[PDB]
Design a protein around this ligand. Structure first.
Ligand code: HEM
Length: 530
């Protein structure tokens, strides 16, 4: 017995390895991880306590490419091969997807100790919003921040925001080069140009107030653009490599929060603290229950976060509404009749209460949010091994879970002819959402306990959206005025564009152009302008 003579050759083989020509060493630096990764997946598939893992050729990268470009097609293929729960590798991360209403329950209603949203999201949002708020703080702090913000999102606030938002839409029709309704009776617009502008203008005026809205008439508006460019998915992957747009982002966060603090300190200086906007509200109502006050910097940062949370969701949504309606003059016609009925042929000024008597308008918003959920995937990082009910699967800590209610929105089983835009599928069901039973309060108000609805555009559980009613108010006013003022249609041979999922906000693929025409060519919009 001389195995020892073989152990010598292990050592010998090792030294011959280190002496390979650089050409072959490089090749082996490639081939070894490639082979190991394939061997690893084969072994992994034998485990019974793990959901099926989607096969991938390139290590670390995983299924990133296909998930990035066409996530719903990716989900549908995986769902056919493996069923509703499956994992895939995404740039060094393992993502476990749970499709359908049971998936909604598993992720949105997960125990606070099981999963973390801030662990998934903070590296992307913290540099944009600033420190101390949203995901740069314990969940209990987030809960109270949401409570604070909801305090300026009351029915009473919406009654005051509606004429403010309407003024901004009319000003945009009057003054924007995309319209100029006093000078032109027809024109062509790119809805991915107009809607972000209309969105920030209307949200600024109502949530931040007249001063902050005035700032957007200046070069200052470009900081918002800069801040926005630091909010892309490459910041998800590489949170900070010293790139140009990273620093413009940091600069913008400091400059914009600086402007908000300036106004906050000015208002406190003059005791000019009213009930006009979210700034007034947070100045009066931002003390945590342990008695610690939000700093002025944190208040400013939270303002940025709130405006940002409403910016891309709403802008994408009003863009899709215009795009679906552009090939549906029958739906424009039907919405126009409702406007004439509810507002007495235009004789009534639009109010928040009359908005609630516009079911078809609200069903249009509801249906667009069904077909175009602006966030195709929501994430949590798994913090404790999770057992998946009625399976033998365990999702270990360190994995991520991914939930996609927008995918379920597009399934025939839950919405017949799911790829058909039909506002009447919501007849006698025009509410933005509603708790279909028992409620629960995580610290920012009573919300639905069950999150099993196949329709979940605002998510659910502790991380549930609080901007839903603001969004309906904003989109409601905006679409009410579009409908009463304009008709619109596609250029010849154009139709509803397919979604672009790469910004991870489900935008229409540009350029998404429509042609508008004034319903009343001679109608003038009053007020002064240069
Ligand atoms: C069409 C409009 C909107 C849609 C579809 C939408 C969607 C969502 C969704 C799906 C979530 C949950 C994310 C998750 O669970 O990971 C969420 C959370 C949230 N959104 Fe919205 N949103 C919209 C508008 C707004 C507006 C207008 C605001 C502010 C005025 C806002 C602020 C927030 C906030 C503060 C959260 C809580 C985040 C958390 O607790 O982690 N959103 N939104």
């Amino acid at each position: 017995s001389i195995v020892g003579e073989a152990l010598e050759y292990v050592n010998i083989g090792l030294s011959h390895f280190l002496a390979l020509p650089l050409a072959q060493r490089i090749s082996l630096i490639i081939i070894i991880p490639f082979i190991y990764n394939i061997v690893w997946q084969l072994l992994y598939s034998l485990r019974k306590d793990r959901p099926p893992l989607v096969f991938y050729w390139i290590p670390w990268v995983g299924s990133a490419v296909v998930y990035w470009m066409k996530p719903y097609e990716f989900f549908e293929e995986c769902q056919k091969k493996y069923g509703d729960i499956f994992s895939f590798v995404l740039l060094g991360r393992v993502m476990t997807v749970y499709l359908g209403p049971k998936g909604h329950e598993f992720v949105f209603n997960a125990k606070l100790a099981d999963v973390s949203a801030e662990a998934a999201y903070a590296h992307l949002t913290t540099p944009v919003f600033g420190k101390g708020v949203i995901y740069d703080c314990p969940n209990s702090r987030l809960m109270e921040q949401k409570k604070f913000v909801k305090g300026a999102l009351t029915k009473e606030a919406f009654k005051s925001y509606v004429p403010l938002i309407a003024e901004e839409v009319y000003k945009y029709f009057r003054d924007s080069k995309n319209f100029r309704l006093n000078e032109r009776t027809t024109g062509t617009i790119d809805v991915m140009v107009t809607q972000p502008e209309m969105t920030i203008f209307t949200a600024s005026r109502s949530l931040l107030g007249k001063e902050m809205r005035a700032k957007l008439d200046t070069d200052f508006a470009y900081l918002y653009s800069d801040l926005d460019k630091g909010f892309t998915p490459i910041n998800f992957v590489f949170p900070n490599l010293p790139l140009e747009h990273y620093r413009k982002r940091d600069h913008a966060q400091k400059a914009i929060s600086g402007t908000y603090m300036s106004l906050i300190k000015e208002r406190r200086k003059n005791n000019d603290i009213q009930d006009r906007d979210l700034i007034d509200s947070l100045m009066k109502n931002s003390t945590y229950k342990d008695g610690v006050k939000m700093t002025d910097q944190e208040i400013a940062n939270l303002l940025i976060g709130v405006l940002m949370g409403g910016q891309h969701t709403s802008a994408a949504t009003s863009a899709w509404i215009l795009l679906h309606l552009a090939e549906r003059p029958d739906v424009q016609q039907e919405l126009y009749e409702e406007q004439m009925r509810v507002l007495d042929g235009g004789k009534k000024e639009l109010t928040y209460d009359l908005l609630q008597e516009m079911p078809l308008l609200n069903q249009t918003i509801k249906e667009t949010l069904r077909m175009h959920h602006p966030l195709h995937s929501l994430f949590r990082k798994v913090m404790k091994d999770m057992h998946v009910p009625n399976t033998s699967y365990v999702i270990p800590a360190g994995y991520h879970v991914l939930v996609s209610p927008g995918y379920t929105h597009l399934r025939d089983e839950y919405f017949p002819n799911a790829h058909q835009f039909n506002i009447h599928r919501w007849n006698n069901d025009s509410a933005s959402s509603y708790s279909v039973g028992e409620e629960v309060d995580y610290g920012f108000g009573a919300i639905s306990k069950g999150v099993s609805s196949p329709y979940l555009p605002f998510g659910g559980g502790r991380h549930r959206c609080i901007g839903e009613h603001f969004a309906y108010c904003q989109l409601g006013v905006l679409m009410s005025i579009f409908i009463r003022t304009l008709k619109w249609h596609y250029p010849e041979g154009k139709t509803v564009p397919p979604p672009d999922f790469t910004s991870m906000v489900t935008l229409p693929t540009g350029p998404a152009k429509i042609i508008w025409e004034k319903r009343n060519p001679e109608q003038k919009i009053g007020g002064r302008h240069h």
